[PDB]
Design a protein around this ligand. Structure first.
Ligand SMILES: Nc1ncnc2c1ncn2[C@@H]1O[C@H](COP(=O)(O)OP(=O)(O)OP(O)(O)=S)[C@@H](O)[C@H]1O
Length: 259
């Protein structure tokens, strides 16, 4: 496994819920130097938050999809370190903001498809991710993003009506939220319903109003987003079907870009 000696902290990366995340270098059993992010848990909330820290680590440790953040190892002895791959382009929302002028639709559709592949995997195990948003999606390379580790100020503007109304979260509410994430991506990181305050969102939804089609979003893709935002969760597509529709859209946008 991994030993603390094999991991050195170089700078701060940022504050996570449970504690500071640092940038470091892990050295392999083969002597390879891997750039890592090291998650830390603040020496605090006795058992409960510290149990939740470890429990979330073990899930991510068992997760292995090419478009979910990669857990490299866990150092359990106090102070506990979770070693993740470092994703050098940071958060998708920031990365979309910076590269607004040069990103084309092909790529926006590709990031959407990647996330949706990750969700199809989660869907296969009836595991609900409740934080499918550009702030929670990391950029591994211009062509590769990874869904972060996020499955009580709730993300109301990202949430399905059932979730806002009853705190029900199912794979179908993740489908609703995933379409909101597509909307963020296609809008270059705008916050959904930025023009409202949280308390106002449900009532807008309840009357059938939806996020408008982003300017660079193909109509075919907006129709997919529309189906995702069906009020009735049974009528929303499943992720396995989104993956197929999204591959088709991607393939069309590539041909269009190439010709
Ligand atoms: N593998 C990574 N590569 C690059 N930046 C990362 C990585 N993991 C986290 N970050 C960044 O570190 C900061 C926050 O870490 P997060 O995991 O988002 O915090 P969090 O979601 O509260 O996580 P925990 O487990 O709850 S502390 C943000 O800047 C993230 O973008």
């Amino acid at each position: 496994g991994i030993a603390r000696e094999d991991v050195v902290l170089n700078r701060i990366l940022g504050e996570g819920f449970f504690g500071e995340v640092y940038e470091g270098v892990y050295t392999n059993h083969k002597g390879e130097k891997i750039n890592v992010a090291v998650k830390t848990c603040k020496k605090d909330c006795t058992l409960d938050n510290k149990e939740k820290f470890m429990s979330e680590a073990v899930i991510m440790k068992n997760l292995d999809h090419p478009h979910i953040v990669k857990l490299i190892g866990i150092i359990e002895e106090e102070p506990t370190w979770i070693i993740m791959e470092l994703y050098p382009y940071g958060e998708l929302g920031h990365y979309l903001e910076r590269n607004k002028n040069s990103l084309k639709v092909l790529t926006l559709v590709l990031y959407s498809l990647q996330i949706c592949k990750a969700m199809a995997y989660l869907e296969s195990i009836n595991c609900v991710h409740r934080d499918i948003a550009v702030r929670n999606i990391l950029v591994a390379s211009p062509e590769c993003v990874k869904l972060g580790d996020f499955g009580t100020r709730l993300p109301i503007k990202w949430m399905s009506p059932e979730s806002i109304n009853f705190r029900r979260f199912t794979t179908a509410s993740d489908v609703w939220m995933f379409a909101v994430c597509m909307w963020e991506i296609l809008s270059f990181g705008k916050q959904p319903f930025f023009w409202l305050e949280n308390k106002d969102v449900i009532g807008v939804l309840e009357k059938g109003d939806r996020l408008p089609k982003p300017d660079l979003c193909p109509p075919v893709l907006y129709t997919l987003m529309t189906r995702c935002w069906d009020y009735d969760p049974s009528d929303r597509p499943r992720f396995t079907e989104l993956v197929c529709s999204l591959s088709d859209v991607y393939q069309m946008e590539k041909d269009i870009a190439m010709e």
